[PDB]
Design a binder for this molecule. Sequence first.
Ligand code: CLA
Ligand code: CLA
Ligand code: CLA
Ligand SMILES: CCCCCCCCCCCCCCCCCC(=O)OC[C@H](CO[C@@H]1O[C@H](CO)[C@H](O)[C@H](O)[C@H]1O)OC(=O)CCCCCCCCCCCCCCCCC
Ligand SMILES: CC(=O)O[C@H]1CC(C)(C)C(=C=C/C(C)=C/C=C/C(C)=C/C=C/C=C(C)/C=C/C=C(C)/C=C/[C@@]23O[C@]2(C)C[C@@H](O)CC3(C)C)[C@](C)(O)C1
Ligand SMILES: CC1=C(C#C/C(C)=C/C=C/C(C)=C/C=C/C=C(C)/C=C/C=C(C)/C=C/[C@@]23O[C@]2(C)C[C@@H](O)CC3(C)C)C(C)(C)C[C@H](O)C1
Ligand SMILES: CC1=C(C#C/C(C)=C/C=C/C(C)=C/C=C/C=C(C)/C=C/C=C(C)/C=C/[C@@]23O[C@]2(C)C[C@@H](O)CC3(C)C)C(C)(C)C[C@H](O)C1
Ligand code: SF4
Lengths: 192, 659, 185, 79, 192, 95
Amino acid sequence: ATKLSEGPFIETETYPAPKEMEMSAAVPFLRYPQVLKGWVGEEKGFDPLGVTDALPVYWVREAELKHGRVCMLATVGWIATDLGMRFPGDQFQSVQTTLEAHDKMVEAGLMAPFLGAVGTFELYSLWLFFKGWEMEVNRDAGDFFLGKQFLPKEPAKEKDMRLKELENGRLAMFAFSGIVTQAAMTGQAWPF
Amino acid sequence: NGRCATSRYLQVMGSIHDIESYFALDNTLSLNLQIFTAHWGHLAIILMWISGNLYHIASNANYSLWIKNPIPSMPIAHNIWDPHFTSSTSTPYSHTTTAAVLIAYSGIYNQLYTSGFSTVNQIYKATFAFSCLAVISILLAKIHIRTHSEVLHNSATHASQIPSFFQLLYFLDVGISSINIRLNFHTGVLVGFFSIAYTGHLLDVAIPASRAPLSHTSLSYLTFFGGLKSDTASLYLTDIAHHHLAIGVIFVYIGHLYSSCSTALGTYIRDMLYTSAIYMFQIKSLHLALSLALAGCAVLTSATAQHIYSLTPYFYLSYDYVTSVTLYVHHSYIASFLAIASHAHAAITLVRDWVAPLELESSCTIARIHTHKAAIISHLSWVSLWLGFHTLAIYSHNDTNMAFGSPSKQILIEPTNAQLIQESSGKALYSFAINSFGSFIYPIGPGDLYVHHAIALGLHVTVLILLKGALEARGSKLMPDKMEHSFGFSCDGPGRGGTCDISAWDCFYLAMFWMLNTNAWIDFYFHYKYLAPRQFSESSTYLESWFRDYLWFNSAPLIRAYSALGTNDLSVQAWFFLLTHLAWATGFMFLISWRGYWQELIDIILYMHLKTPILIDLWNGGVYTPLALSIVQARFIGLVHFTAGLILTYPPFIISTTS
Amino acid sequence: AVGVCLPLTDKFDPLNLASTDEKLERYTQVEIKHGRVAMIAVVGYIMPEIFRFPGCESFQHGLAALESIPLEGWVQLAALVGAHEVLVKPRAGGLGTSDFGLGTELLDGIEEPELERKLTAERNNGRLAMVAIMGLMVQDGMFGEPPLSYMSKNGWWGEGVQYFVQHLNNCQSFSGSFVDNAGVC
Amino acid sequence: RVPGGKRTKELGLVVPIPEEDGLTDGQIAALFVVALVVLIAAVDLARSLYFGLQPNKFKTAKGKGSITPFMKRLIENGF
Amino acid sequence: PFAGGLIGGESAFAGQDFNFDPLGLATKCEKFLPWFREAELKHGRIAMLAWVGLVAPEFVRIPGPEQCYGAKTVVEAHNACAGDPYFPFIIDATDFYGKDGHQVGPLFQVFAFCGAVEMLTTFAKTANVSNKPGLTLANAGDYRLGANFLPEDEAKAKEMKLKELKNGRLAMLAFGGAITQATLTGNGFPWL
Amino acid sequence: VNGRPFTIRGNPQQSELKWTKYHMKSYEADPLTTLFIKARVMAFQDIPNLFALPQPNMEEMVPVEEYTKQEYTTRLMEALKRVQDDRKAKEAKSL
Ligand code: CLA
Ligand code: CLA
Ligand code: CLA
Ligand SMILES: CCCCCCCCCCCCCCCCCC(=O)OC[C@H](CO[C@@H]1O[C@H](CO)[C@H](O)[C@H](O)[C@H]1O)OC(=O)CCCCCCCCCCCCCCCCC
Ligand SMILES: CC(=O)O[C@H]1CC(C)(C)C(=C=C/C(C)=C/C=C/C(C)=C/C=C/C=C(C)/C=C/C=C(C)/C=C/[C@@]23O[C@]2(C)C[C@@H](O)CC3(C)C)[C@](C)(O)C1
Ligand SMILES: CC1=C(C#C/C(C)=C/C=C/C(C)=C/C=C/C=C(C)/C=C/C=C(C)/C=C/[C@@]23O[C@]2(C)C[C@@H](O)CC3(C)C)C(C)(C)C[C@H](O)C1
Ligand SMILES: CC1=C(C#C/C(C)=C/C=C/C(C)=C/C=C/C=C(C)/C=C/C=C(C)/C=C/[C@@]23O[C@]2(C)C[C@@H](O)CC3(C)C)C(C)(C)C[C@H](O)C1
Ligand code: SF4
């Protein structure tokens, strides 16, 4: 039963039996949100906080993809910098540890152009996101048309690829959060 | 519609934002969505105004230097880049080799300084962040337009099986027109939680910035001292933080009153209003909601105007002679505008929103008021007449006796009631101290009594005019069928004895003059008592003291600003003193000379243009045929000129006298 | 039509160069490419003043960059541009030769008025960029430094038009003036 | 300055002026970039306000419209 | 029926219903009966845990930071573990690692996790829009945690729920008595 | 022409016909509309017995593509009677 209540009017409505109700797999004591249907990762309906009950699933999926991608890049970059990989250059080699890298590069003046480039791309992304959400252009959430060549043709393989992206981004979220917190706490390389 | 006259522009501009009057605005859904989008744009404008003020303080001004020596230093508002200024020699606003600057009379410097701004970098970060907030506001407007469009599309695409699907027509604007949830979240989060958040801000930033020695945030930052710290001459910051904490807690508690997200908790406003003394009213009426909001905003603006001056909340604000007066006058004028606005929108509510019952039925508050509107108006007229007669007569008695040179013959009624209230307040404050409050208690004399009765006269007459307009808006003995006609219409003809200024909009036009008068009286009282407390106390009992010791005496620096001898930094004030005098005098034209004369003059001018050789062969006059301004258009334009001149000729005077 | 905006009710072609459809199409393609190159070149003029990529700090900015950058580097840049121009062809079924299937997702399945507005905005920005880039290059060549740095040093009116405004307030550089104020305009 | 105020002349109040301008060209440029973003968004908002709601969208626009579950709950609750 | 047919109001003797509502709170506030049952079961659960938590520390103590884990008795254990923050539940920002001794202790960590669990389970079941039947008499106190263990028979399920309720009530009373006696006499397990 | 069959004050209230044909012209409403609006204002004084419109169940929404008009009216009437019975029971519970 996908209907919250059956009946023409609220006061005389009847509710489906609990056995008939479709329950979320992630949290079995809540009903399936039913708005994140047809999306990637819906197999385990997980929205206990009811965020999708207020925001369109498009927005939250765009945000999830952005966070996962940013965190994946951030964790790989933090790991590389901790292991010692650095750009060939006096300003980049002067900085010793990754923790002070943000401040050192802000002082050196590279982070200002870096933020300018990221902000330009992000204004473009905001425009594109509004266009896609309003359906002016035919775009999906978190889709920038990059590397569509490598996207599998089969619908099942495409869904599997998108699910792998989402799961890896979710893992990278926790990975980077733990990495940065532990680094700030102790002050050692990524292996800790 | 190609067939148009030059009155087209004025007709449109008089109702550009009268969204209810828009063509093709079919439903309340469209009305509410348009209003919501306009609100978002308005918030964006406010945030851009804040960002511009912050940017100009950061760039063109001297905040860092001012905070070092706030007492003698004067803040800079912004630079002057005006080609018309003299280039041969330095201007009065420059240091003879430096960009011209303007002093700032807004107290924003004190605001930032006591908020915790120490460096121009912080102001720059704020400028940036408020610009981002403006972007966010506009994007939220767009988001909500899209969401509401998506609900209409859904309702179009999906339909309930039963014929009652048309019931959904009413609930499309539930998000914008729901009252219980809006009240709960506004009073709990927008007010109470905002106060708690500002308490947190104070404790984290403002208290450490003010206190030279470092100390960890704790309950020691919350205190209940009272009065002004001697060093900054302002309210203790630690008390402001507790204040806001207490108010925030109280309003967070009050914000659970109504049922907002679930029907299991909370009560209903319909139900309270139904069971209370006020029977019920059109809470859905947007004009009524606007009227209530405007009344509340007016009272709060008056309260801040009085209390910012009485109890100084900002560092060194009292030391700034000019900024105090400017702030008081600014917020007094804003409060008066908001009050008369609430009255005007109540009148509009009556005109086009209230659903009057049948005549004999008397069930609602509005109907009960309409039953005895005549008694209300007659008693208000009696009070106004009494106040005017006796205030003017006592003032004239004092005037004549002083002119003959016998002050002992003046009628001087001691303000015993006000003095008793003041003494009780002082007793309470002294008990609290035993367990300073500057400007909260003032000497109070017979001159104060007379000025207070004059201000009461002004308020009573303004309310008289506004109440008469509101209660005669639907109908009147002279014009029984006034509901059919719009809120503002020219007249009803020269028949029935003549019907000039017969509309509720005409009552507002009339009450506007009074508002300006009563506000001018209030501002004159404050400014005179501020400039010369002793002279005001001794001499304010007769009107020649006001005309001579206040206006004529203190007008010297302003008029002397620029002359054959030279110019000083008040030359701009002197030019705006005269520009505003001219604007007032121009408003007199539209107020006195009415439309027929000007229409005939326009006809003659049009004849001349059509007889001119070259111009006739190009300009027919058919499109946008010139016409004289309509009766209501000219009333409004003359009122605007009058208001602009009256309001804008004062700030130059106050700045000149207090600087 | 595409390329015609409000200020011009009809197509602007006083010399009647686009007499035939073939010539009109060729000129449209050339104008689109020129406007694109001019737009990127104008941002190219403004941005190096704001910042320089690592390793590019030493190089001169404007026309001086032609001499400053190694001939090998210029060869590499021209080789990249030539590879792009030779190995990229218009997408089959596209709007014409001017399009190369770059960002066409944004314009697919849109209303024709909106597509026309986008094309006209592209063309108008390209035209303004052509005018602006010629201004920038001519000023750089004449005054020896990029226009943005030149304006920072001398202002909007510098050494060619300052004579007109030598007696203006905040811009007064006339002989014997109590203030120079020549670098602030 | 050539002060014209009695109190200013009496008390020697001054308008101190810094030696260097508070903000630099780069900072002003960043603020102008943000202002330009605001201007573009504001022009879009003005266009949306001018054209109002479009009830015809259900005839041609993509998708089938959507009402958020919270909006549905508000509708069911009523006013 | 009585209290909306909720379980737990039956006397030990067969045929007589204890139906303990001296103040008639069920009838006075029937619309809050599911909430009352949820609160009763939650109190019983926390109390059954808390009594064993009063007993076990005497037998064994984990070797955490000695600021709390060296507490003499359960009475002082709460005060030791809650730390001495400037405000009850306020983290110290200037001194994050508690060098000044004004940092919240491990009880803050457990409190934060309890709050997350509460917001994601109880508030989720009760207030979520996508869960319209939500909290009712039938499912009150049921989060489907371990429901696969209870006996299939409905009578046996009712008996098990009654056992849970009775043990939770007994634990509520026992913990109250134990903590109060510990405060009064400050002795070991016999007066806890 | 332009004749109205009632006294001048017989015109309907402007606020009563809002967002209708006569949005702001109560002096152009037909006599039948005037009579109907007058009867509505008389009817809506009796607050104690006014049928509150049932709140719609937004769950039961289906596409327009997805019977008889009379049959649907009858079904709506059965639903309304059920709602009235439920309201009566709920109010009589505590009174
Ligand atoms: C202004 C006076 C007032 C009045 C006459 C009522 C009347 C009513 N309210 Mg209440 N209500 C009020 C204020 C008022 N309320 C306020 C200020 C709030 C916000 C907290 C609420 C929130 C509220 C809710 C959420 C609900 C009611 C309900 C009710 C009904 C039952 C009352 C009851 O059982 O009380 C007896 C109960 C008590 C006295 C216990 C109250 C304890 C809590 C903590 C509130 C006390 C807060 C306190 C006054 C302020 C603290 C300030 C701080 C500085 C310490 C009744 C119609 C219920 C109802 O049936 O609605 C249809 C309902 O669901 N009210
Ligand atoms: C298209 C033009 C247009 C524009 C530019 C605006 C602009 C505004 N409208 Mg809108 N409005 C429009 C058309 C427009 N309106 C139309 C056509 C209507 C239909 C009649 C409305 C109906 C309407 C209503 C009903 C309200 C607004 C309000 C507002 C404000 C929006 C939010 C804001 O920034 O408030 C900034 C405001 C503040 C920061 C001040 C907040 C304090 C409030 C105003 C007072 C609260 C008092 C409280 C109720 C009682 C206190 C009690 C105490 C004394 C004990 C702003 C002034 C709101 C408002 O504030 O009105 C005064 C409001 O309530 N408008
Ligand atoms: C100061 C107040 C004032 C002003 C400015 C005017 C102005 C005018 N009145 Mg008078 N008038 C006044 C009060 C005033 N009146 C009052 C109180 C009444 C009621 C009794 C009348 C009743 C009245 C009547 C019945 C008639 C006039 C006429 C006129 C016009 C005279 C001819 C003319 O325009 O030449 C002079 C114009 C000016 C001095 C206006 C100011 C020009 C300035 C100095 C230059 C502008 C500079 C620049 C371009 C501004 C750009 C601003 C922009 C960029 C923002 C003129 C528009 C007569 C008319 O229209 O004849 C053709 C006419 O028939 N008036
Ligand atoms: C600067 C500080 C000091 C001055 C402060 C401002 C002056 C004081 C305010 C004026 C007092 C009245 C205010 C009430 C306003 C609403 C009144 C109203 O709509 O009725 C004005 C009425 C409305 O019009 C009438 O409406 C009726 C329906 O109610 C009927 O249809 C009538 O036929 C019709 O005439 O009359 C007009 O049409 C007036 C003509 C307006 C012409 C203005 C065109 C020029 C505008 C240039 C200025 C820019 C405007 C934007 C301002 C920017 C600000 C950020
Ligand atoms: C033509 C065109 O357009 O471009 C193409 C190019 C191409 C390549 C095809 C594309 C792509 C895809 C790309 C580039 C995909 C990159 C994916 C990355 C970098 C994933 C990193 C995951 C890291 C994880 C999970 C870390 C996990 C870390 C964990 C779990 C760490 C865990 C601990 O550290 C923690 C947290 C604390 C430690 O104490 C203990 C340990 C266990 C070490 C494009 C862009 O799409 C299109
Ligand atoms: C196109 C394409 C491809 C491609 C490509 C490639 C390699 C493209 C590369 C593009 C590249 C490398 C683009 C850099 C931009 C940098 C910007 C915009 C920086 C702005 C920076 C700004 C606006 C900063 C401004 C300031 O803040 C500064 C710095 C100082 C402050 O005082 C304030 C100001 C405002 C002044 C594929 C993937 C190969 C195939 C595909 O099929 C098609
Ligand atoms: C129902 C029934 C009957 C009954 C009954 C009766 C009389 C029931 C009475 C119940 C009663 C009276 C129950 C008290 C509980 C107290 C509690 C939980 C206190 C916790 C207190 C705690 C957890 C305190 C903790 C701390 O303070 C500590 C210790 C140290 C501090 O540093 C820190 C803090 C603050 C955290 C009858 C009469 C027999 C009839 C019928 O037969 C059945
Ligand atoms: S035209 Fe003017 S003077 Fe004549 S009745 Fe109308 S408002 Fe009065």
